C-alpha cells in the first residue's frame, strides 16, 4: 500500500514529507532543495513550477505567480484581495466575484483561479514524492493557518483534489508543528505550547492548549505582511545605496536589477545565519557594471533590528489574549525559515528568560513533517 504524504504549501515555499521506515523524510527536490517556492511561471512555450519558476522571476514578472495562498478561499471585492492586488506584478481580475490571475501563456491570454495556480504548487509537491517514493501518491494531509475559514479551507482541499490527491485531512499548521515534535502526546493534564512561526511573507504567533492528543487554540497574533521578505528588502535598499557611493548610479528604476540585487540579497541572507559574513557578487547588474561586495551578520542586523524586535509583541499580545504569563507556557517552537535567523531566537530566549527553543527539527520542515506524522496515523 502506497505511502501518504503530508505537505506544507506556504505562501512563499511548500514542503513535502513521508512517515516511511518508522521515521519521517523530509523529501529533497530535483536540485536538491528540502523546500520548494510556491511559484508558476507562464511563458510562451511552456508552464514551470517551483525553482525553475522563481528562478526566472526577473525576466518575466507579469507572468510569474506567487502569493496565491493570500488569495485562495477569498472575493474578489475582499478587502484583503483589494489591498494585496496593489503590489503583484501579475494582473488579477473579477469572474463572479472571485479572483483570477491572468497571464500570457503559449501566446494566450489565461486567467487561472487561485486554487488552480496552488493545485500547481500541490502538483510538483506530489511528484518531488512520487520521484522518491518510486510509485504514485494518491494520499494527502495538508496544512493551512489557523485563522483561515471555511472558504479558504474548501479551496485549499480543492486545490488538492485538482492535484489528483485524496485530502485525507486539512490541518492548522501550529497544530503540525506541534505533532512534529511529539507534543499531542502531553501526558497527565493540559500543557501550554507556544508557535512562533516567521516564515517567507507572514508571521504567526499561536498559543495552543493540548490536553490529551485534543488540540485548543487559546490564541493567535500576528502581521500577515511581516516575514524574510522584509529582511531581503533592507539589504535591497542598502546595496542600491551602496552602488550610488561607489558608482554614483540608481538602479532602483530597473525592475530587472532591482530583482536580481534581490536574489543576491536573499541568499546572503541565509548564509549569515551561518556565518558572520556573506560576499556579494554579480555579473552586470546595472550597465555592464559588476557589484562585488560584502555584508556582516553584525550590519544585517543593524538594517533589521527593528523588524526583528517587532516580532515580540504579538507574543505578548497572544500571551495576554489567552490570559498566561510566560511562566505558563510549557514548550516554545520555531516554525518558519526566518527564525533560523540567530538575532530572531536571541530575542525570543530572551523574551522567554532563557527558556530552550525547540528547534531541533528545521524551521521551515516543521510543519510539513507533522503533516507526514498525521498522514501516517490517518492511513493506520
Ligand atoms: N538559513 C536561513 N536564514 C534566514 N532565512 C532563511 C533561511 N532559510 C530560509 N529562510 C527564509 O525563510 C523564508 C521562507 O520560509 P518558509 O517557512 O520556508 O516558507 P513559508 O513562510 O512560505 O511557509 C524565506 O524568507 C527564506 O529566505
Ligand atoms: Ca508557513
Ligand atoms: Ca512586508
Ligand atoms: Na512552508
Ligand atoms: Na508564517
Not at 77 to 97: E, L
Request: glycine share 8%; net charge neutral; proline share 3%.
Amino acid at each position: 500500500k502506497a505511502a501518504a504524504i503530508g505537505i506544507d504549501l506556504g505562501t512563499t515555499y511548500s514542503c513535502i514529507g513521508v512517515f516511511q521506515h518508522g521515521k519521517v523524510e523530509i523529501i529533497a527536490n530535483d536540485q536538491g532543495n528540502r523546500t520548494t517556492p510556491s511559484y508558476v511561471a507562464f511563458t510562451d512555450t511552456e508552464r514551470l513550477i517551483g525553482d525553475a519558476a522563481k528562478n526566472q522571476v526577473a525576466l518575466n514578472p507579469q507572468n510569474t505567480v506567487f502569493d496565491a495562498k493570500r488569495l485562495i478561499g477569498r472575493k474578489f471585492g475582499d478587502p484583503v484581495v483589494q489591498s494585496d492586488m496593489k503590489h503583484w506584478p501579475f494582473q488579477v481580475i473579477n469572474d463572479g466575484d472571485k479572483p483570477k490571475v491572468q497571464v500570457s501563456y503559449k501566446g494566450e491570454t489565461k486567467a487561472f483561479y487561485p486554487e488552480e495556480i496552488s493545485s500547481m504548487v500541490l502538483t510538483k509537491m506530489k511528484e518531488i514524492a512520487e520521484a522518491y517514493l518510486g510509485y504514485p501518491v494518491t494520499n494527502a494531509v495538508i496544512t493551512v493557518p489557523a485563522y483561515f475559514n471555511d472558504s479558504q479551507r474548501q479551496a485549499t482541499k480543492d486545490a488538492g483534489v485538482i492535484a489528483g490527491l485524496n485530502v485525507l485531512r486539512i490541518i492548522n499548521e501550529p497544530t503540525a508543528a506541534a505533532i512534529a515534535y511529539g507534543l499531542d502526546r502531553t501526558g497527565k493534564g493540559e500543557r501550554n505550547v507556544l508557535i512562533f512561526d516567521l516564515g517567507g511573507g507572514t508571521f504567526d504567533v499561536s498559543i495552543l492548549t493540548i490536553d490529551d492528543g485534543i488540540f485548543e487554540v487559546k490564541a493567535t497574533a500576528g502581521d500577515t505582511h511581516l516575514g524574510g521578505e522584509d529582511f531581503d528588502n533592507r539589504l535591497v535598499n542598502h546595496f542600491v545605496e551602496e552602488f550610488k557611493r561607489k558608482h554614483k548610479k540608481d538602479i532602483s528604476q530597473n525592475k530587472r536589477a532591482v530583482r536580481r540585487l534581490r536574489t543576491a540579497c536573499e541568499r546572503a541572507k541565509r548564509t549569515l545565519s551561518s556565518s558572520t559574513q556573506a560576499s556579494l557578487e554579480i555579473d552586470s547588474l546595472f550597465e555592464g557594471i559588476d557589484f562585488y561586495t560584502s555584508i556582516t551578520r553584525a550590519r544585517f542586523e543593524e538594517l533589521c533590528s527593528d523588524l526583528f524586535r517587532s516580532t515580540l509583541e504579538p507574543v505578548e499580545k497572544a500571551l495576554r489574549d489567552a490570559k498566561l504569563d510566560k511562566a505558563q507556557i510549557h514548550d516554545l517552537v520555531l516554525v518558519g525559515g526566518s527564525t533560523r535567523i540567530p538575532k530572531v531566537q536571541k530575542l525570543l530566549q530572551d523574551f522567554f528568560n532563557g527558556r530552550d527553543l525547540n528547534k531541533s527539527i528545521n524551521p521551515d520542515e516543521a510543519v510539513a513533517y507533522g503533516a507526514a506524522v498525521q498522514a501516517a496515523i490517518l492511513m493506520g
